[PDB]
């Protein structure tokens, strides 16, 4: 029905420039956002072994160490019409506590270039269980990454550009290191006039 399982949700996810006016009148630009403050399409996780790592951590792994309903695809129009500060700013919900350990991967042509992880321990909301990972540093490499794709002369370049650029992240419990939330981000430039749109898919495997 939505990017989450029963076990947990992703509440809100956004990546996102602040510029150095916000001082004084606050902005902040959104390469891209999801709120979940009707079920989803599957799309076989086979078609995409090949966008991202083999080995450990690979998606083939990934999706033999299951659980199988925990993985999910996030297609992105990212906004890229706009020294700031870049963040990424992530919160999940559980009914459980739990720490998360949360991994984010930038693959290019299917090769791991920079990994983050985090650690985040449980906080106590309105009968439920929260995880904010807010403001969290962008790391140079895609800062870096955004400042050239901006400078390109045609969108159909940033399409092939974005292409051959994946994200991966899997969040696990650290204590048990049972498999949480698998996300494989594929991406691809929103229009000059239009926003950063997304469409969630499950991702699924013939048992045949
Ligand atoms: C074309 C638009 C690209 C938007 C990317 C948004 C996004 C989406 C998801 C995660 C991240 N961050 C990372 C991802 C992987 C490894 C990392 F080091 C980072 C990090 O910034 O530390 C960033």
Redesign the pocket.
Known sequence: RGLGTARLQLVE?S?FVEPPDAVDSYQRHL??HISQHPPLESVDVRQIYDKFPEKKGGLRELYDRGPPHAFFLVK?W?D?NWGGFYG?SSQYESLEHMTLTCS???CSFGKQV???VETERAQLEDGRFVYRLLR????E??VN??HK?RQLPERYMMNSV?EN?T?L?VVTNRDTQELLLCTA?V?E?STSERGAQHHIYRLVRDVE
């Open positions: 996810f990546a390469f891209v992105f990212a890229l990424v984010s991967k930038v920079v990994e983050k969290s540093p962008m790391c490499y895609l990454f955004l794709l974005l650029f994200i992240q981000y991406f430039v």
